[PDB]
Design a binder for these strands. Structure first.
Lengths: 52, 52
DNA sequence: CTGTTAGGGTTAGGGTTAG
DNA sequence: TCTAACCCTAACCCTAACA
């Protein structure tokens, strides 16, 4: 089921990119809580954040 | 302008869903004739067909 | 086979008309 | 007034090219 990205997931993604680096989606996924997301979904959300 | 759906288009759409499955709009659009429609239009028609 | 990421392609679903 | 047809676009998928 399609799930909009919540504020806390967005925060974790940004924290993850600052610490682990842009592109290291799998590593980011392993260090923070996300709502049943895969590393591809993180990559995609990052692209959307840039667009917004 | 606006274009209501003819019985032929509906037949193809339903045949398409059976053969390719619901949600595979672009593949369906590629294998049957439709009145200048996009994959999104097929998806919207299916929704209405379900709502009727 | 399990898993990875970049990037183009596609779909879900709530909102917007046309008539 | 009502609603099927159409729009917007974030979210998600497919594929290449590897490890």
């Amino acid at each position: 089921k399609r799930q909009a990205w919540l504020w806390e997931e967005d925060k974790n993604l940004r924290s993850g990119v600052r610490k682990y680096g842009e592109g290291n989606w799998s590593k980011i996924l392993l260090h923070y809580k996300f709502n049943n997301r895969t590393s591809v979904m993180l990559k995609d959300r990052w692209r959307t954040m840039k667009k917004l």
